[PDB]
């Protein structure tokens, strides 16, 4: 059923699963019209579809042309998400298809369930976790490929870089979620933490900097401080 703290290690067992986050699919800027009314302008979006065990990220870029002439876009976005996730599963070899898909927002359940009717043995699950995947567009290379797209496009990444060579998938996911939680809570300070030292670079084929094990402990500690603080500066504690 629902995914929560009680069954959290299930993410890192050997049943293929994907998280689907739709929070960046339909993105707009709100602005004033010459007449003084308000209008939206859409910008490119993305579906964030992530294998938490392996780090494989299927980033389906949603180009603004998909919204042209359409009504009720926030509703359409959930069904567009489900259409693209279903298309992705059908494109995978059977032995690569997920046994479960976990949606980060419950409004994705019915759209995905309907699109996946042909896959009755794939479980569609919500979660009680408040995962910070919305912050994916704070990862510079992901933001860059989304904003530069001129057409629909799928781009594949490993969101863990090479971490699984040194750490388990439970630890890698924990680090990912801490980084993203920090970026969501205070993007500038989070990004300052990640890049303050010019000698630690991001490899061309990576998303995050090439930290040593020790430097990752310092970094993770600074992210927890940031998250703690902001929770004071927010709640005055």
């Amino acid at each position: 059923g629902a995914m929560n703290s009680s069954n959290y290690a299930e993410l890192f067992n050997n049943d293929i699963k994907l998280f689907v986050d739709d929070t960046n699919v339909y993105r707009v800027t709100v602005h004033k019209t010459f007449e003084g009314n308000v209008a939206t302008k859409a910008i490119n979006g993305c579906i964030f579809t992530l294998n938490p065990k392996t780090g494989h990220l299927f980033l389906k870029i949603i180009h603004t042309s998909v919204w042209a002439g359409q009504k009720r876009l926030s509703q359409l976005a959930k069904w567009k998400t489900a259409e693209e996730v279903s298309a992705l599963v059908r494109s995978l070899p059977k032995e690569e298809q997920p046994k479960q898909i976990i949606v980060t927002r419950k409004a994705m359940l019915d759209p995905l369930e309907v699109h996946m009717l042909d896959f009755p043995n794939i479980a569609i699950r919500p979660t009680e976790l408040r995962l910070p995947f919305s912050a994916a567009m704070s990862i510079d290379k992901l933001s860059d490929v989304v904003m530069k797209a001129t057409e629909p496009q799928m781009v594949l990444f490993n969101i863990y870089d090479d971490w699984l060579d040194r750490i388990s998938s439970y630890t890698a996911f924990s680090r990912l979620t801490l980084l993203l939680r920090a970026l969501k809570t205070n993007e500038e300070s989070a990004k300052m933490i990640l890049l303050s030292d010019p000698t630690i670079t991001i490899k061309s084929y990576h998303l995050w900097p090439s930290f040593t094990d020790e430097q990752w402990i310092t970094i993770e500690s600074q992210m927890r401080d940031l998250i703690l603080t902001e929770y004071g500066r927010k709640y005055n504690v």
Partner: protein, 300 residues
Amino acid sequence: MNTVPFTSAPIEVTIGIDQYSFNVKENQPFHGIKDIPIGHVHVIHFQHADNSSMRYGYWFDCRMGNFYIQYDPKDGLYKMMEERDGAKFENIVHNFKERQMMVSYPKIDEDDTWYNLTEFVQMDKIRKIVRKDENQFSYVDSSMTTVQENELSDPAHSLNYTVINFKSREAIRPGHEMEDFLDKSYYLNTVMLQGIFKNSSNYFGELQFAFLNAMFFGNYGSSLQWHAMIELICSSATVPKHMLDKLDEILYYQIKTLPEQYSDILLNERVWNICLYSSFQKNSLHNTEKIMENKYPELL
């Protein structure tokens, strides 16, 4: 005007006949029900005094044979039977009327309630939902489950209502997923009306039968079916105008008939609020919305 005689009444029982009911005491000299209107299906139903569990009864049409009730002390219930000897039957009945041992079907002449509740209900269709082909009448009780309930266990004792499932391949055309889920007109008009029921009369007949089973026997699986058939119409943007007008009449009389103390368990809050206030047909059910708002405003 036809008659359903009783051999006897050995156990204390509340007897229903359509929307009427009366109490019969243990071994009271009761020999049946007379003056039953021809032209409608009917239901005769029972609740034993000792055990309020297992409400049960019989759907029948007096045009299809001579039917009587006889208590079975082994199976412990009043059983409907058919008498094939026509002269034996008439002779039995005439004797019982002469001694005035029968209750009269107590229809007020102004009153169209029963017609309005069974307008589209036919015995032939009841017998396909309730499969027991050797009998012309159909037994139903509180506990019987529906085919769809059994998919989610004795098939002989099931209610074979038409399966309706909004998240099903039958309901959703490949490539129209959002369109077909948010506007069920395809599923209503093509799959169900043209394909399965053939016309709206058969659809309404099954809807009315499900309601009655749900009210009279407390059949939870009939309620499920009644609400599903309402919801499929209300969630369709494209419904023939005559169906909508007829549905409003059908539901009005169903809601009118539901006694105040049984609606809390029967009325599914979500279906009714969606149908009356959110759905495509939110503005098409004026009589039903007015009685619902005046009779049952809490649910909403």
